[PDB]
Amino acid sequence: ETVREARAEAFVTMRSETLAMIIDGRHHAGDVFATARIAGIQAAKRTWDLIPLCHPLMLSKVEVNLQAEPEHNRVRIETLCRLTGKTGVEMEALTAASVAALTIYDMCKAVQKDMVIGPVRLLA
Amino acid sequence: ETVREARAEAFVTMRSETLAMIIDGRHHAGDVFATARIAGIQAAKRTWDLIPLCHPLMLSKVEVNLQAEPEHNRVRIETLCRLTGKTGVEMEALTAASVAALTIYDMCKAVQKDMVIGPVRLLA
Amino acid sequence: ETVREARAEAFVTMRSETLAMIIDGRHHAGDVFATARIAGIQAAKRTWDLIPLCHPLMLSKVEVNLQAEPEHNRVRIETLCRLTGKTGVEMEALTAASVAALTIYDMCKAVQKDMVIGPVRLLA
Numbered sequence: 497e498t499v500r501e502a503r504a505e506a507f508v509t510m511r512s513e514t515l516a517m518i519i520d521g522r523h524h525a526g527d528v529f530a531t532a533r534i535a536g537i538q539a540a541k542r543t544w545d546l547i548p549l550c551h552p553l554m555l556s557k558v559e560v561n562l563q564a565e566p567e568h569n570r571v572r573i574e575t576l577c578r579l580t581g582k583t584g585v586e587m588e589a590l591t592a593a594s595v596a597a598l599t600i601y602d603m604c605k606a607v608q609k610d611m612v613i614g615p616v617r618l619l620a
Numbered sequence: 621e622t623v624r625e626a627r628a629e630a631f632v633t634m635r636s637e638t639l640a641m642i643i644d645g646r647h648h649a650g651d652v653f654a655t656a657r658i659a660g661i662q663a664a665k666r667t668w669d670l671i672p673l674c675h676p677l678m679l680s681k682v683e684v685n686l687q688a689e690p691e692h693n694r695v696r697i698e699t700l701c702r703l704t705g706k707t708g709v710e711m712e713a714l715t716a717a718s719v720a721a722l723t724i725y726d727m728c729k730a731v732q733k734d735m736v737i738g739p740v741r742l743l744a
Numbered sequence: 745e746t747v748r749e750a751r752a753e754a755f756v757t758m759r760s761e762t763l764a765m766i767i768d769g770r771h772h773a774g775d776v777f778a779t780a781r782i783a784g785i786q787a788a789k790r791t792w793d794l795i796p797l798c799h800p801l802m803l804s805k806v807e808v809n810l811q812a813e814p815e816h817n818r819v820r821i822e823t824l825c826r827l828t829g830k831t832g833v834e835m836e837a838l839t840a841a842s843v844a845a846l847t848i849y850d851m852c853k854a855v856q857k858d859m860v861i862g863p864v865r866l867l868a
């Protein structure tokens with residue numbers, strides 16, 4: 497039994513107006529980043545129930561951080577998962593990143609029909 | 621890693637007729653107290669999934685006890701949660717008490733529109 | 745804290761045509777056995793949430809195996825559950841077997857109205 501951790505990233509690519517709306521609605525009720533962070537945290541804790549062969553685990557830590565990248569017309573999501581145990585937490589990190597990305601998508605899709613999620617991958 | 625425990629209480633205040641109906645339907649199919657106890661136990665085990673920042677834990681014990689207080693026109697709910705681990709179980713105890721209270725409410729609301737839940741708090 | 749395990753079996757009895765359809769659709773998209781295995785695995789991990797008094801546990805292993813028994817006009821399901829902990833996994837094994845059986849039933853019920861599930865029991 498050891499300390500295990502994993503980090504993942506995801507991106508959501510969108511038009512400039514769409515990203516500007518996220519930036520302008522930040523820190524207000526309906527905060528896209530706040531909502532996506534909570535969604536990702538909740539999703540990480542449910543990973544065992546979403547991915548058939550994953551084991552139930554006791555996550556002691558899940559972090560989801562989001563940043564606008566206006567220069568690339570996209571949002572970057574980075575996640576961190578940690579626990580002390582025998583099973584790793586790669587899928588928790590990826591699932592948290594993915595559901596955070598889907599939540600950004602959900603909150604922007606009225607404005608834009610052709611957003612793209614990706615890449616979604618582990619960080620070294 | 622130690623033995624951790626928490627106790628909570630909740631109250632549901634109602635008219636005398638409403639409480640009398642609970643007392644009279646006790647030990648029969650549709651037992652309000654039996655249903656509320658099971659709801660509270662189930663809710664305690666799901667606390668991590670209801671409260672965003674709570675950690676998943678392995679509850680080894682959850683107890684929910686209910687008593688009519690005819691003298692005060694109310695039901696009192698007391699809960700107990702225990703486990704051996706590194707994280708406490710205050711939220712499990714409060715959530716079990718709260719959902720037990722909501723279940724009493726649900727089973728009585730046809731009869732009464734203005735029941736009040738509270739206080740809900742930890743016990744020392 | 746020790747290694748704990750449990751094994752269960754379940755049977756679904758059906759007409760010969762119904763069983764033949766399962767055998768003939770095996771290894772194809774809509775594989776009844778593949779679907780039932782995944783359902784049973786997922787169900788085992790949720791046992792604590794289905795059975796009110798069961799404890800949440802960290803299952804390290806769940807196996808679900810299915811075999812056609814043409815000679816008896818039935819499907820046999822055998823399950824295995826294991827973990828290292830203080831609480832046994834009998835209910836996880838039985839629940840995995842039961843939900844696997846219900847999934848076989850679901851996937852065959854258009855064809856047959858009078859299938860029977862049982863026995864469902866622990867193995868020694």
Ligand SMILES: Nc1nc2c(c(=O)[nH]1)N[C@H]1N2[C@@H]2O[C@H](COP(=O)(O)OP(=O)(O)OP(=O)(O)O)[C@@]1(O)[C@H]2O
Pocket residue numbers: 543544549550551552553583584585586587588804805
């Ligand atoms: N929650 C959660 N669970 C996880 C992962 C995760 O990131 N998060 N990674 C691992 N894990 C689940 O188990 C896989 C690894 O298999 P395992 O080594 O536990 O199987 P064993 O019991 O050793 O036996 P074999 O099956 O190896 O023979 C796996 O790749 C998942 O399927």
Ligand SMILES: Nc1nc2c(c(=O)[nH]1)N[C@H]1N2[C@@H]2O[C@H](COP(=O)(O)OP(=O)(O)OP(=O)(O)O)[C@@]1(O)[C@H]2O
Pocket residue numbers: 556557667668673674675676677707708709710711712
């Ligand atoms: N199921 C469940 N979970 C619970 C509680 C509960 O009653 N029941 N209480 C605790 N806990 C969750 O974690 C909170 C306490 O934070 P923590 O001390 O674990 O965080 P750490 O990993 O130490 O890092 P920081 O974030 O402290 O820097 C908390 O207050 C909950 O948010």
Ligand SMILES: Nc1nc2c(c(=O)[nH]1)N[C@H]1N2[C@@H]2O[C@H](COP(=O)(O)OP(=O)(O)OP(=O)(O)O)[C@@]1(O)[C@H]2O
Pocket residue numbers: 680681791792797798799800801831832833834835836
């Ligand atoms: N997931 C899951 N959980 C399980 C089982 C299972 O197969 N799978 N078997 C056990 N268990 C739940 O706990 C029952 C056994 O009770 P227990 O010995 O834990 O209670 P204690 O805390 O010792 O106190 P008392 O209540 O004994 O006084 C039980 O029979 C279940 O109710």
